[PDB]
C-alpha cells in the first residue's frame, strides 16, 4: 500500500500598493520690529490670475458625457451586430446541413437504384419501371396512329419491358447471392458471439474465415488446411473423414503444382463441406442454439 507523503498550500489572492503619511504641523510666528529677529529665507512670487472655471468644467463634462453616450450607442450597435452575426451563422449552418442531408438522401436513392440490396429498393425500382411503362402507354394512346400497327407498337413496348424485367431479375439474383453470403457471415458471427463454448465457436469461425480468404499465400493456405484437417481428424466422424480426404486431395494437387484457379472450385467445395460439418452439435456445442 501507500500513505500520504506531504502537501503544500498556496492561494493567489489579489494584492495592491498602499500610501500612508502622517500629518504635518506648521507654526507661523510674527514679531514686532526689533523685539524678535526672524531669519528671512522666503521667496517672492508674481501676482498671478485666478478664475469661472465652473463653466469650463461644465463644458468638459458635457463633452465627456457626449463621448460616454457615443460609447453606449457603440455598445448597443455591437450587441446588434453580434445578434445579426449569430443569426446569419445559424442560418448558414442550417442551410448547409439541409443541403448536405438532401445530397445524402439523393445519394442513398441513387445507390438503391444502382444496387437494390433492400427489398424496398427492389420494389421501388419495379414501381418506377411500371410507372415508366404506363407513361409510355399513355404517350402511345395520345399519339393514336396506325391502329392496325398499334399492336406492333404494343409488342415493341412489351419487348422493351421484358428486357427491363430481365435486367431487374439479374440484378435481383446478384443481390440475392450477396444477401446469402452476408447471411452466412452473420450466422457465423452470431455463433461465435464469454464462455468456453463461445471460445470454441470463435476458433471455428476464425478457421472458417482463414479458409475463405482472398489472395492468401500458398504456404499459409496449406498450413491452414493442415490445421483444419487436424481439427476434423480430432472428431474423426464419417463426414470428417470425407472432408479430410477432400482436403488431402487438394493439398496433394497443390504440392504437385497447378494454378490455384484450377482448384478454386474444389476449394469452395471443401469450404462448404467444412462449414456444414462445423454447423453441427458435435463440432460446436453452441450449434443447438442455432
Amino acid at each position: 500500500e501507500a500513505d500520504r507523503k506531504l502537501s503544500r498550500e498556496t492561494q493567489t489572492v489579489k494584492i495592491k500598493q498602499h500610501s500612508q503619511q502622517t500629518v504635518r504641523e506648521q507654526a507661523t510666528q510674527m514679531a514686532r520690529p526689533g523685539v524678535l529677529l526672524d531669519n528671512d529665507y522666503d521667496k517672492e512670487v508674481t501676482p498671478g490670475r485666478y478664475q469661472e472655471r465652473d463653466e469650463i468644467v461644465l463644458r468638459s463634462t458635457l463633452r465627456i458625457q457626449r463621448w460616454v453616450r457615443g460609447w453606449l450607442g457603440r455598445k448597443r450597435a455591437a450587441y446588434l451586430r453580434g445578434k445579426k452575426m449569430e443569426r446569419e451563422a445559424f442560418l448558414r449552418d442550417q442551410e448547409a446541413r439541409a443541403q448536405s442531408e438532401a445530397e445524402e438522401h439523393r445519394r442513398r436513392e441513387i445507390q438503391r437504384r444502382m444496387h437494390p440490396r433492400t427489398a424496398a429498393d427492389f420494389e421501388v425500382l419495379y414501381n418506377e419501371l411500371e410507372a415508366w411503362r404506363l407513361q409510355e402507354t399513355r404517350k402511345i394512346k395520345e399519339a393514336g396512329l396506325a391502329k392496325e400497327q398499334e399492336q406492333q407498337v404494343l409488342q415493341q413496348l412489351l419487348h422493351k419491358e421484358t428486357k427491363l424485367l430481365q435486367t431487374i431479375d439479374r440484378l435481383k439474383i446478384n443481390a440475392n447471392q450477396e444477401n446469402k453470403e452476408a447471411r452466412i457471415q452473420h450466422t457465423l458471427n452470431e455463433m461465435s458471439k464469454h464462455t468456453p463454448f463461445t471460445t470454441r465457436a470463435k476458433e471455428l469461425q476464425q478457421l472458417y474465415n482463414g479458409l475463405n480468404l482472398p489472395l492468401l499465400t500458398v504456404d499459409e493456405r496449406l498450413d491452414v488446411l493442415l490445421h483444419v484437417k487436424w481439427t476434423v481428424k480430432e472428431f474423426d466422424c464419417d463426414l470428417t473423414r470425407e472432408l479430410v480426404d477432400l482436403i488431402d486431395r487438394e493439398a496433394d494437387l497443390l504440392n504437385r503444382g497447378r494454378n490455384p484457379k484450377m482448384l478454386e472450385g474444389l476449394r469452395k467445395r471443401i469450404s462448404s463441406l467444412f462449414l456444414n460439418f462445423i454447423e453441427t452439435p458435435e463440432f460446436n456445442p453452441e450449434a443447438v442454439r442455432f
Partner: protein, 84 residues
C-alpha cells in the same frame, strides 16, 4: 517580469515553465486556451504528468508532489504549474 508566489521544482524546470508560460501567453490570449497550451507544453517538457491553471482570482490548497509544484504570477494573471 514574472513573480513566483510559490515553487517546488528545479530551477531549470522553473525557468522552462516560465518560458512556456510566456510563449503560451504570447500565442494564446484565452485563460482556458493559455492553460491548455501551458499544460501541453509542460507535459511534453518535463514529465507526462502536468497540471496548468490560469486565472486571476483562483486561490486553492491542493496536495502536490515534491519537485513538481509551481505557482507564479506573470503580469496580471496567476499561473499554477504542477504535475498530475
Amino acid at each position: 517580469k514574472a513573480v513566483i508566489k510559490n515553487a517546488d521544482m528545479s530551477e531549470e524546470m522553473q525557468a522552462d515553465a516560465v518560458d512556456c508560460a510566456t510563449q503560451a501567453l504570447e500565442k494564446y490570449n484565452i485563460e482556458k486556451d493559455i492553460a491548455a497550451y501551458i499544460k501541453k507544453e509542460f507535459d511534453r517538457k518535463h514529465n507526462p504528468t502536468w497540471h496548468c491553471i490560469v486565472g486571476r482570482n483562483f486561490g486553492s490548497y491542493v496536495t502536490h508532489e515534491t519537485k513538481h509544484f509551481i505557482y507564479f504570477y506573470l503580469g496580471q494573471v496567476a499561473i499554477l504549474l504542477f504535475k498530475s
